[PDB]
C-alpha cells in the first residue's frame, strides 16, 4: 500500500514539472522580428522627412 502511495506522488510530481511551451515561444520570437523590422522601417522614413 505504501509503495503505491509513493508511486502516485512521483507520477504527480513528474506531471507538474514545467515543460517548454513551443506554441508560445515561437510567437515571442516572431513578435521580436516584426518589432525589429519596424525599427529599421522607421529610420528610413525619418531620413526621408529630413
Amino acid at each position: 500500500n505504501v509503495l503505491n502511495k509513493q508511486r502516485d506522488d512521483t507520477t504527480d510530481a513528474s506531471r507538474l514539472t514545467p515543460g517548454e511551451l513551443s506554441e508560445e515561444q515561437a510567437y515571442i520570437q516572431q513578435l521580436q522580428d516584426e518589432m525589429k523590422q519596424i525599427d529599421e522601417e522607421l529610420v528610413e522614413a525619418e531620413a526621408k522627412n529630413r
Partner: protein
C-alpha cells in the same frame, strides 16, 4: 413539471426514508414532489416500520408495497422466483402515478446492487419500465459494494449480474460506495463511529441539489434532460463519480471561510469522492457542477478556469469545454438532528472519467476467483439460472473494460 421516485430494498427505502424527510422539511414549487413515491421490498419489516412511524398519515396506505418473504441476498431468487409475483403489482401502480402526472421529467430509482431485492427485482422493474416508456429518463443512484469494506459474501455474484442490466436500462448511473462515505464522515464530518442513518442523510443532500433546479428559480437552471447530453459522450458510458462540498460540521463551518473558489477545488480532490476510486489514474471526460444558494456566475466562471490550468488532474484530449455549470438561488436546508451546518452555498459535482474503469477491474478478480471453483453457484442455479448467464455477464464486464481503455486513449 414533476418527477417520481422509486425505492427498492432494505437500502433503497431507508435512503428514501431520509430523502423524503428532507423534501417535506424543505417545502407551487412543491408540485414536482407533492408523495409521488413507491416503496417496495420483499421483507415486510422495514416497510412496516414506516407504516407505524412518525410519517403514518403522510404516505397513502397503498403506496407502501410489501411482499411476503425475502429474496435473501439471492439475485436469481429476487429476479426469477419471487420477483415475478410482486413486480407486476408495483409497475401497474407506477403507471397510474404517471397518468396522474402530465409533464413527467422522469423516474429516479434507488437500489443497492449487493442484495437480492435491490439488485434482482431492481433490474426486473427497470426492464418493464424501459419497454413501457422508453424515452422518459430513469436516473439510477445505486450503491455498489466497496473493495475492502463488505457485509455480504456472494455480493460479487450479485453486482456483476445486476450491472449487466444497469448498462442498457438506466440513463444516468451514479456510483456510491460505503467505504468512501465512511471515509467522508470520518475525515470531514469527524464522526468516528457512523451508522447507516448518517450516510443516508448526506445521500439525500446530493439528490436534492440536482433537482433543486426544477423546483426553484436560479440564475442558470438545468433539467434532467440536460445531464443526458452534457455528461455521457457515448450511449454505454454513463457511470458518474459524485462529490459534495462543503461537507462540514457545525463548529468548523463558522470558523472556515466558505467561498466559491475553494469549494470548486474541494469538490475535485479524491479526498471527497463518494466512490472509492482515485481519479488521478483516470482522465476526466466531462464535469457537471451544481451550485446552490449565494452564487454569482463570475466566481464559478473563474473557478473552472483555475481547474483547467492546473496539472494535478487532466482531461481527455477531446473536450476543451469539459464543463457544465448550473446555478440555483435557494440555499440548502438543514434537518434537526443532522450534522451538516447551514451554509450560504454548496456544490454537488457529478463527473465522468476513466477511474471507474478501475472498480470494474477490481471487481472482476473477486467474482472470477469464486466462479472458477463454482462456489455458491448451486444456490442460484436451483433458483432458475444456468451456467450460461454467469459466463456471459463475465464477458460483458470484460468488454466494458476494453471500452473504457479504448475511449480513454
Amino acid at each position: 413539471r414533476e418527477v417520481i421516485s422509486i425505492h427498492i430494498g432494505q437500502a433503497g427505502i431507508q435512503v428514501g426514508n431520509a430523502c423524503w424527510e428532507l423534501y417535506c422539511l424543505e417545502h407551487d414549487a412543491f408540485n414536482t414532489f407533492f408523495p409521488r413515491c413507491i416503496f417496495l421490498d420483499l421483507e415486510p419489516t422495514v416497510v412496516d416500520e414506516v407504516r407505524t412511524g412518525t410519517y403514518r398519515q403522510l404516505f397513502h396506505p397503498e403506496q407502501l408495497i410489501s411482499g411476503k418473504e425475502d429474496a435473501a441476498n439471492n439475485f436469481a431468487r429476487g429476479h426469477y422466483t419471487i420477483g415475478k409475483e410482486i413486480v407486476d403489482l408495483a409497475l401497474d401502480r407506477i403507471r397510474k402515478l404517471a397518468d396522474n402526472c402530465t409533464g413527467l421529467q422522469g423516474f429516479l430509482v434507488f437500489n443497492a446492487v449487493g442484495g437480492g431485492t435491490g439488485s434482482g427485482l431492481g433490474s426486473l422493474l427497470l426492464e418493464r419500465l424501459s419497454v413501457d416508456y422508453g424515452k422518459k429518463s430513469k436516473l439510477g443512484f445505486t450503491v455498489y459494494p466497496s473493495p475492502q469494506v463488505s457485509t455480504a459474501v456472494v455480493e460479487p455474484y450479485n453486482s456483476v449480474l445486476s450491472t449487466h442490466s444497469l448498462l442498457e436500462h438506466t440513463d444516468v448511473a451514479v456510483m456510491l460506495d460505503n467505504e468512501a462515505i465512511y471515509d467522508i464522515c470520518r475525515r470531514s464530518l469527524d464522526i468516528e463511529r457512523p451508522t447507516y442513518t448518517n450516510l443516508n442523510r448526506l445521500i439525500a443532500q446530493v439528490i436534492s441539489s440536482l433537482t433543486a433546479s426544477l423546483r426553484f428559480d436560479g440564475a442558470l437552471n438545468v433539467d434532467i434532460t440536460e445531464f443526458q447530453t452534457n455528461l455521457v459522450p457515448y450511449p454505454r458510458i454513463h457511470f458518474m463519480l459524485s462529490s459534495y462540498a462543503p461537507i462540514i460540521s457545525a463548529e468548523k463551518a463558522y470558523h472556515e471561510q466558505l467561498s466559491v473558489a475553494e469549494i470548486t477545488n474541494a469538490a475535485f480532490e479524491p479526498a471527497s469522492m463518494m466512490v472509492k476510486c482515485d481519479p488521478r489514474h483516470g482522465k476526466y471526460m466531462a464535469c457537471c457542477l451544481m451550485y446552490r444558494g449565494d452564487v454569482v456566475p463570475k466566481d464559478v466562471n473563474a473557478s473552472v478556469a483555475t481547474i483547467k490550468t492546473k496539472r494535478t488532474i487532466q482531461f481527455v484530449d477531446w473536450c476543451p469545454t469539459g464543463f457544465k455549470c448550473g446555478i440555483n438561488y435557494q440555499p440548502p436546508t438543514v434537518v434537526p438532528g443532522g450534522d451538516l451546518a447551514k451554509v450560504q452555498r454548496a456544490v454537488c459535482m457529478i463527473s465522468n472519467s476513466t477511474a471507474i474503469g478501475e472498480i470494474f477491474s477490481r471487481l472482476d478478480h473477486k467474482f472470477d476467483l469464486m466462479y472458477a471453483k463454482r462456489a455458491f453457484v448451486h444456490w442460484y442455479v436451483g433458483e432458475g439460472m444456468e451456467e450460461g448467464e454467469f459466463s456471459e455477464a463475465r464477458e460483458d464486464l470484460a468488454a466494458l473494460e476494453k471500452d473504457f481503455e479504448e475511449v480513454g486513449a
